[PDB]
């Protein structure tokens, strides 16, 4: 009972202090944001 409850409490301190554990889901948004932003930037190019 003391081991299970103490392990759950460490999750709150791990996600608050360390934000890189969720970086797997952050790359999904970054790859989608960089793909849309770069796709827009080609409209200003003259393309010859």
């Amino acid at each position: 009972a003391n081991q299970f409850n103490s392990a759950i409490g460490k999750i709150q301190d791990s996600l608050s202090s360390t934000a890189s554990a969720l970086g797997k889901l952050q790359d999904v948004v970054n790859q989608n944001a960089q793909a849309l932003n770069t796709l827009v930037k080609q409209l200003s190019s003259n393309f010859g």
Partner: protein, 48 residues
């Protein structure tokens, strides 16, 4: 209303909405992160 907006520098289309954005006294227009002009100062009166 959505119609053609041409102020002295360019021809475009959009809807005018009063916002809190401010421009320099000698500044005409400005662009967003997409390299597209989101606002143009009135060539006659002073407004953004």
């Amino acid at each position: 209303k959505c119609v053609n907006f041409n102020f002295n520098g360019l021809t475009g289309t959009g809807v005018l909405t009063e916002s809190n954005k401010k421009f320099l006294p000698f500044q005409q227009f400005g662009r967003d992160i997409a390299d597209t002009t989101d606002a143009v100062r009135d060539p006659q009166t002073l407004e953004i």
